[PDB]
Design an enzyme around this catalytic site. Structure first.
Site, PDB file in Angstrom:
ATOM      1  CB  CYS A   1      -0.827   0.035   1.284  1.00  0.00           C
ATOM      2  SG  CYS A   1      -1.854   1.541   1.333  1.00  0.00           S
TER       3      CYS A   1
ATOM      4  CG  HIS B   1      -5.285  -2.266  -1.341  1.00  0.00           C
ATOM      5  ND1 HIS B   1      -4.427  -2.792  -0.406  1.00  0.00           N
ATOM      6  CD2 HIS B   1      -5.031  -0.936  -1.382  1.00  0.00           C
ATOM      7  CE1 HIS B   1      -3.663  -1.834   0.091  1.00  0.00           C
ATOM      8  NE2 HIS B   1      -4.008  -0.694  -0.487  1.00  0.00           N
ATOM      9  CD  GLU B   2      -6.022   1.717  -4.397  1.00  0.00           C
ATOM     10  OE1 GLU B   2      -5.048   1.118  -3.884  1.00  0.00           O
ATOM     11  OE2 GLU B   2      -6.325   2.903  -4.114  1.00  0.00           O
TER      12      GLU B   2
ATOM     13  CG  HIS C   1      -7.206   3.357   0.205  1.00  0.00           C
ATOM     14  ND1 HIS C   1      -6.542   3.746   1.345  1.00  0.00           N
ATOM     15  CD2 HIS C   1      -6.369   2.520  -0.453  1.00  0.00           C
ATOM     16  CE1 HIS C   1      -5.333   3.204   1.359  1.00  0.00           C
ATOM     17  NE2 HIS C   1      -5.210   2.438   0.286  1.00  0.00           N
TER      18      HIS C   1
HETATM   19 ZN   LIG Z   1      -3.495   1.190  -0.101  1.00  0.00          ZN
HETATM   20 ZN   LIG Z   2      -4.077   3.287  -3.130  1.00  0.00          ZN
END
Ligand SMILES: [Zn+2]
Ligand SMILES: [Zn+2]
Ligand SMILES: [Zn+2]
Ligand SMILES: [Zn+2]
Ligand SMILES: [Zn+2]
Ligand SMILES: [Zn+2]
EC number: 3.5.1.88
Length: 180
Positions: A91, A133-134, A137
């Site tokens: 990350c 993953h994104e 966020h």
């Molecule tokens: Zn990340």
């Molecule tokens: Zn990212």
């Protein structure tokens, strides 16, 4: 521009829906793709570049001139697969830190494009991994939240070193602490 690093509160703040699809948004998406290519990414979310809005730029190939540039505004994961898989994740908000996260292997996504039209899409393998993953966020979720207790222990000290850097840069107490 700059990449926001843990434990900066931006990475946990509420990310606002986008209602306006204009030259400004067009320009932000492009700055974002450019940071993503600069950093050799497959996906990038607005909070990671300091903007709390629900916008992700994504290219499944993760390289200039390959794959396709996908803009995902106000995205949602409509389905996750039952099948799960491990993978060493990094990350950009945690420089140099890599550890195993288990995630569903595939997902189906709904979002809007740069002009605001609704589209859906399905991903698997490495793109699905990064997308998740994104997308985390955008929900104020960071990858260590998804790690086992055993795996988190292996990166605790490294996260504490980042907590300290924040406190030294800002003069404020780190707003979250892995000890917690
Ligand atoms: Zn990340
Ligand atoms: Zn990212
Ligand atoms: Zn800059
Ligand atoms: Zn550009
Ligand atoms: Zn690459
Ligand atoms: Zn400690």
């Amino acid at each position: 521009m700059e990449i926001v690093e843990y434990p900066d509160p931006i990475l946990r703040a509420k990310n606002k829906r986008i209602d306006i699809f204009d030259e400004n948004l067009k320009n932000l998406v492009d700055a974002m793709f450019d940071v993503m290519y600069k950093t050799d990414g497959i996906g990038l979310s607005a909070p990671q570049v300091g903007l709390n809005v629900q916008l992700m730029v994504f290219n499944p190939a993760g390289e200039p001139g390959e794959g396709k540039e996908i803009v995902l505004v106000n995205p949602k994961i409509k389905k996750y697969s039952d099948k799960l898989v491990p993978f060493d994740e990094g990350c950009l908000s945690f420089p140099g830190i890599y550890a195993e996260v288990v995630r569903p292997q595939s997902v189906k996504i709904d979002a809007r494009d740069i002009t605001g039209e609704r589209f859906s899409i399905s991903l698997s393998r490495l793109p699905a991994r990064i997308f998740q993953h994104e997308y985390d966020h955008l929900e104020g979720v960071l990858f260590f939240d998804r790690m086992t207790d055993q795996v988190l222990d292996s990166i605790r000290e490294e996260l504490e070193a980042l907590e300290k850097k924040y406190e030294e840069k800002t003069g404020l107490p780190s707003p979250e602490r892995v000890e917690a």
